[PDB]
Write a protein that binds this DNA or RNA. Structure first.
Lengths: 242, 242
DNA sequence: CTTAGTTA
DNA sequence: TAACTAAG
DNA sequence: CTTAGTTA
DNA sequence: TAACTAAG
């Protein structure tokens, strides 16, 4: 089936992603910013044990590395690790928000394309590398020393925009090679639209092959492939309605 | 002095006023109104004894009379009697508010008239009679039976406007007979302005004589007569300033 | 006393 | 939501 | 855990 | 002013 033909494209089979064509991102600070080091709220053993294997997996994957940084933000003591990056966000230069609202994005769907494929990318932000100069920005304490992210982190205010822009650059060629297909991108949520079941299945094969090649990974479990009706961005797409 | 020449004009000497040229006022109700009878909150003996001689004086003066009315509003249990006429006010037809704001009224004072007389009328509203058909509107309980007002009452939403309009009608002739004088009226607060101390003193004599004749009474105690500087409506009038 | 409107 | 504030 | 924004 | 509410 779909899973077997494209082992590289699916998170289930291809391993953790890494966007090989994308240069490691440099994150510019506002002109007056200096590092802020916020103390870690003491964590209960229950929370620590809950979070631990997630931290170990990320270390194993090279997504977290040890560091010493003048920056520090807290992990929430209440599992799965959630970092409060608000004080970092305040010190990072704003970028223009280029991610379209879903209502506007969907206006780009013609009544002519009614065969749909929906993919969502797994651990999307983690596919984007962070330049070593920007890594220390995102440090947190783990017990003893600090760890930090080598990839675009959750909770960082510019992650959705930077990811959406990176994927747009990576999929520019695909769009050109398949000028009849409709591809909607909302950060990590993709909808491919076609006129026929055949166009859709050939399109979908090409999109998966392309994604896998670029280093992105889709969720095989959640994939809606070549259906006349799909869920996308909390809409039900059917009869060309919605 | 001023007090002796005009015994009729001063509250101190002329007795309680009564505007003899003014027809007893009829107070129109809104189209859907019916009487409201609000129970009297029990009054402490302390309050009752405090209020009593005021009530007796008003009865002696014919300003309050006994009655039986389907209307009733409460006197406040916490001296000097204050009637809560809000439920009556809600049922009475609105009139246009014609009393100018003091800021606008004072704009009518030319730099040329800098000799001032200020009078305030004592118990102004009580000078205006209420038509017997409208008297029952304002009834309250006194202990046992009801009493009501035979004159325009305090706390009634249209009293200031109706009084201001009535006094304007009564002083229309005076204005015509003294076209050089400036007369400002703000309900019961009057300012007469003149070019010279002589004009002011002759004007003031005429205004007092006219007021006394019409049945209004000014406070001799508070009167500011023929001064180059006076207090009027919480302003200090001096040098033509304010 | 109750109550319409504002501020905390 | 509670507390004031100004009023009748 | 803290905190910016809304509602009560 | 207190209480929620959604977030990082």
């Amino acid at each position: 089936t779909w899973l077997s033909d494209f082992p590289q494209a699916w998170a289930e089979t291809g391993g953790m992603g890494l966007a090989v064509r994308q240069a490691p991102l440099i994150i510019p600070l506002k002109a007056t910013s200096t590092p802020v080091s916020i103390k870690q709220y003491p964590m209960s053993q229950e929370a620590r044990l809950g979070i631990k294997p997630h931290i170990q997996r990320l270390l194993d994957q090279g997504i977290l590395v040890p560091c010493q940084s003048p920056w520090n933000t807290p992990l929430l003591p209440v599992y799965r690790p959630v970092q409060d990056l608000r004080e970092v966000n305040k010190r990072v230069e704003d970028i223009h928000p280029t991610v379209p609202n879903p209502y506007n994005l969907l206006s780009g769907l013609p009544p002519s394309h009614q065969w749909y494929t929906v993919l969502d990318l797994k651990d999307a932000f983690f596919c984007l590398r962070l330049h070593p100069t920007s890594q220390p920005l995102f440090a947190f304490e783990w017990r003893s020393g600090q760890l930090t992210w080598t990839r675009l982190p959750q909770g960082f205010k510019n992650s959705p925009t930077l990811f959406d822009e990176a994927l747009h650059r990576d999929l520019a060629d695909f769009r050109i090679q398949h000028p009849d297909l409709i591809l909607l991108q909302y950060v990590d949520d993709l909808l491919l639209a076609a006129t026929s079941e055949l166009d859709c299945q050939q399109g979908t094969r090409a999109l998966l092959q392309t994604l896998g090649n670029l280093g992105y990974r889709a969720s095989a479990k959640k994939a809606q492939i070549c259906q006349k009706q799909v869920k996308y961005l909390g809409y039900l797409l059917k009869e060309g309605q919605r």
